[PDB]
Subunit: 249 residues, 2 copies
C-alpha cells in the first residue's frame, strides 16, 4: 500500500515464525546482552498478568537459567498492584508459568495518590487519563529503582503491534532492552502456546488487533482500518524517539 510498505519495513514483523527458532533467537539476544555487560547481575520486569509481560518474563527466566549453566544472574519478577490487586488470578497464573528466581511486590498506590495530591494542591487537577499515566510512570520508577538496587537492567515488553498503536511516554514500557520488538500480537500468542502457558494468559483503538497484525504482516486491510492504523502510527512517532533536537526534527 506504499505507506504500509514503510511501516512494514520499520516494524520488522516476520511473515511467519517458527516457534522453536524464534524463541531460540529471542533468548540469544537476551543472553548476548547480559554476557556483553559486566555489571548485569539481575533482570527486572513487572508482571501484570497480561500476555506481553507473561511471554517476556518467561523468555527472560529461560535465558537466565541458561546463562547460569554457562557460568551469575537472576530474574526478578515484580508485582505492581495499584491498591488491591483485582486481576490477582492472571498475575499469579503468570508467575506460576514463569517460575521467577525472585518475586518483589511493590504497591504503587501510596506514591501515585501523593503525586496526584501534590499537583492538586498546586492547582493542577489531573483527569482520570492523566492519573493513569502517573500510575504507569510510577511502575517505571519501581522497576528502575529495583534494577539499580539489584545491579540489573529493566526489560521492556514493547512489540510491533504496540509500537504501531496502543504505551505511556517514559512510563511502564520504558526499559533498557525490549526483546520482543518485531513480534506482532498473534505471534506472541503462538510463542506462549508453544511454551505451554495456560490459555487464560493469551486470550477502543477503532481497529482490531487482527487488522493491526495483518497490516504489520503486509497484508491488505480495509481502507477504513488503514486510516486508523496509519493515523495511530503517525501520532505516536514521538514515542519511538527521545526528545527532538535541531538535528532530528
Amino acid at each position: 500500500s506504499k505507506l504500509q510498505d514503510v511501516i512494514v519495513q520499520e516494524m520488522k514483523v516476520k511473515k511467519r515464525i517458527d516457534s522453536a527458532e524464534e524463541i531460540m533467537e529471542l533468548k540469544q539476544f537476551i543472553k548476548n546482552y547480559v554476557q556483553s555487560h559486566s555489571f548485569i547481575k539481575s533482570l527486572v520486569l513487572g508482571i501484570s498478568g497480561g500476555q506481553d509481560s507473561t511471554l517476556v518474563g518467561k523468555l527472560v527466566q529461560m535465558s537466565v537459567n541458561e546463562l547460569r549453566e554457562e557460568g551469575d544472574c537472576t530474574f526478578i519478577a515484580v508485582k505492581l498492584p495499584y491498591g488491591v490487586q483485582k486481576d490477582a488470578d492472571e498475575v499469579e497464573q503468570a508467575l506460576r508459568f514463569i517460575e521467577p528466581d525472585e518475586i518483589v511486590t511493590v504497591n504503587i498506590k501510596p506514591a501515585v495518590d501523593q503525586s496526584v495530591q501534590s499537583l492538586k494542591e498546586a492547582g493542577i487537577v489531573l483527569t482520570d487519563f492523566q492519573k493513569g499515566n502517573e500510575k504507569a510512570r510510577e511502575r517505571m520508577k519501581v522497576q528502575f529503582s529495583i534494577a539499580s538496587n539489584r545491579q540489573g537492567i529493566v526489560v521492556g515488553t514493547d512489540h510491533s503491534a504496540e509500537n504501531i498503536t496502543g504505551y505511556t511516554k517514559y512510563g511502564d514500557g520504558a526499559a533498557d532492552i525490549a526483546p520482543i520488538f518485531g513480534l506482532n500480537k498473534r505471534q506472541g500468542r503462538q510463542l506462549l502456546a508453544y511454551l505451554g502457558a495456560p490459555k487464560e494468559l493469551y486470550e477502543a483503538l477503532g481497529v482490531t488487533y487482527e487488522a493491526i497484525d495483518n497490516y504489520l504482516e503486509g497484508k491488505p486491510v480495509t481502507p477504513e482500518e488503514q486510516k486508523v492504523i496509519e493515523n495511530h502510527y503517525i501520532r505516536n512517532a514521538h514515542k519511538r524517539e527521545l526528545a527532538y533536537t535541531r538535528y532530528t526534527w
Copy 2:
C-alpha cells in the same frame, strides 16, 4: 583517534558559536516546533537554578514572547520542583527573575518521593542515597509531564552534548522531555549564551576529567591520552541513555 571524530560528529558541537546567531537559531527551532503542532498551548520546564534550565527557560520565554506577537497563543510554565526546602532557592529565585516566566507553579516532590522510598522499603528494597536521588529526578519528570498533559503542552528538556559524557542525567528522569533545544551545545557554550543575555551568576569530582577537557574534546580539540580515555569510556558507558531500549535491530 577516530573515536573522537565519531563522538564529535554525533554530538554536533560547533568549534565556535556567535552568541546572537546561536540564540536566534535555538529560538527558531522552538518557535518552529510550536508553530508546527497547533494543539501545543504551553511549554513546561523545571527551573532548578542551574545553568542549563536557566538558559532553556530564558530561550523558551523569548520564544513564546515572539510567538504571541505573531498571533500564536502559547504559554511558558516554569515549575519549581523542591525536595523539602528548595536546595538553591537564591539561584532558583534569581533564574525566575531573569526568565520572567508567564506562569510559575510549585510542586514539592518530597511526599511522593518518600512514599516511593517507603513503598520499596516495605518490599525489602532499601535504596541508597544515589538511588533516592534517582527517584527525585524521575518524580521531577512525572510532575512536568503531568503539568504538560493537563495544560495541553509539551515538556522542554535541558539535555546538551556535554551531558553525554558527564551523564548526570538519570535515565528516564529529569532530562526526559518532548524537545531538547540546546542539544549540540557544550557547557562553555551554554555559559556564553547566558552571559550574552545578561544573566547574573547562574553561569569533589570523580569523573576523572575536567569540564574544560570535555568541552575541548567535543569541539574536536586534542586532549591528553588520559583525558581521551576517561572521556571515551564515559561516552560508551552512556550510549544506552541517548537511545531507546535496545532491540534485536538496534543492538549490533
